């Protein structure tokens, strides 16, 4: 009835997709080979998981996902792993050479070789839908494929579909921790090119999740798997309203309607609570008010920034499980009372509420404790202007010397595109400065 297509671009996208699809199969009881042990009805019915899983053959559920990568390493990890029989063999699309953390490669040189194949696969998936709401694109800014090919695919999908919601789950470049030396270039170019072709891009940060795993989960040494599982919990909290009925449902279009005040400001920060280990779970009364208050703690934000340095323009609180709406009402009123949580004057109604019935599902061998309820906050705040200014300063420092510029110019990039992207980023910084002014 209502379908959603997930697109996983780059290594980060594919790994987060592995985590998300493990969590989906756990929540819906789908075996790793697509079979269902309680498969009483075959060939129809509801079975609300038709949003992400399509019924094929006789008693097999195939994810509505396209995995895209330019090198075969990660997709081959997928092709020979636990869920090799889950995905359609043609949904796992690979090139032959990586983008080498080069936006120019993944956008012009290499992305042009498989963009048509990816779009044809996406078209084949979309033709099997009757109520396709939108797409979910998982990627990272500071990467190669996940930046250049992500922007190219966003442009092509904006051309082909147009009015379908285009949501992104992006790994924002951390302010201190980093992987690539040329992350500012790729991040600025991606932001410039995919800005007007995206509806809502959810921001997460590896450094903030590191800090959350250290402080809250009591994990001194987490790997990328723990980060991927937490991001998967966030994704499941976002899509649970589609996959499960609740007291107050929120489809995907309501996110872009409620969280995006202006067409150029669509970067809401992800936040999840409660995130606690199993040891301290027995010593806390995880009430609605406690989790609602923990959602606004500066130490619990999934992006390394300080919300107290800015104002909230739009906030979305998605509750799950044993949640009473009166308690949500009271907790949000208490939040509005606090003077340390500043909202813009031009948004007197600042919250959007969603309440589901399905409690969070514990992944076997996971980190998070079994809780009765959880809240995922998607807040659009002006505090991300500081992160954008930091990225702009790094970009300026690297570009004033023309460092690494030849690596992009020799791949089909015209040098003026750097200047154009930088001017647009300055304009975006001015946008964020202007919306934060009370008048």
């Amino acid at each position: 009835m209502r379908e959603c297509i997930s697109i996983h671009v780059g290594q980060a996208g594919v790994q987060i997709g592995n985590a998300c699809w493990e969590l989906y199969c756990l929540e819906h009881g789908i075996q790793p080979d697509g079979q269902m042990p309680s498969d009483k009805t075959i060939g129809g019915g509801d079975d609300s998981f038709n949003t992400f899983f399509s019924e094929t053959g006789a008693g097999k559920h195939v994810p509505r996902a396209v995995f895209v990568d330019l090198e075969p390493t990660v997709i081959d990890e997928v092709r020979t792993g636990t869920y090799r029989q889950l995905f359609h063999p043609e949904q796992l699309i690979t090139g032959k050479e990586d983008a080498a953390n080069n936006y120019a490669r993944g956008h012009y040189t290499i992305g042009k070789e498989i963009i048509d194949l990816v779009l044809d696969r996406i078209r084949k998936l979309a033709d099997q839908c009757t109520g396709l709401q939108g797409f979910l694109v998982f990627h990272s800014f500071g990467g190669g494929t996940g930046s250049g090919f992500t922007s190219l695919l966003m442009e092509r999908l904006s051309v082909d579909y147009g009015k379908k919601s285009k949501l992104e789950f992006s790994i924002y470049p951390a302010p201190q921790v980093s992987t690539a030396v040329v992350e500012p270039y790729n991040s600025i170019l991606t932001t410039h090119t995919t800005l007007e072709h995206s509806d809502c891009a959810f921001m997460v940060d590896n450094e903030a999740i590191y800090d959350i795993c250290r402080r809250n989960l009591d994990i001194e040494r987490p790997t990328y798997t723990n980060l991927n599982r937490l991001i998967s919990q966030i994704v499941s909290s976002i899509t649970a309203s589609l996959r499960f009925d609740g007291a107050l449902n929120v489809d995907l279009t309501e996110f872009q309607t409620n969280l995006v005040p202006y067409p150029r400001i669509h970067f809401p920060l992800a936040t999840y609570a409660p995130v606690i280990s199993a040891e301290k779970a027995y010593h806390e009364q995880l009430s609605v008010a406690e989790i609602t208050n923990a959602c606004f703690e500066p130490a619990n934000q999934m992006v390394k920034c300080d919300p107290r340095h800015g104002k909230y323009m739009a906030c979305c609180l998605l509750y799950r499980g044993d949640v009473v709406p009166k308690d949500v009402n009271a907790a949000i009123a208490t939040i509005k009372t606090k003077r340390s949580i500043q909202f813009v004057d031009w948004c007197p109604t600042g919250f959007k509420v969603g309440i589901n019935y399905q409690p969070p599902t514990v992944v076997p061998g996971g980190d998070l404790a079994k809780v009765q309820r959880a809240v995922c906050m998607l807040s659009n705040t002006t505090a991300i202007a500081e992160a954008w200014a930091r990225l702009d300063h790094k970009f300026d420092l690297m570009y004033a010397k023309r460092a690494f510029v030849h690596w992009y110019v020799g791949e089909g990039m015209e040098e003026g595109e750097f200047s154009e992207a930088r001017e647009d980023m300055a304009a975006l910084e001015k946008d964020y400065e202007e919306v934060g002014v009370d008048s």
């Binding site: 067409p263 001017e423 300055a426 001015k430 946008d431 919306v435 008048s439």
Partner: peptide
């Protein structure tokens, strides 16, 4: 540089 969103176009 100038902003691009029209947040003040009809400030009346």
């Amino acid at each position: 540089v100038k902003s691009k969103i029209g947040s003040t176009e009809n400030l009346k």
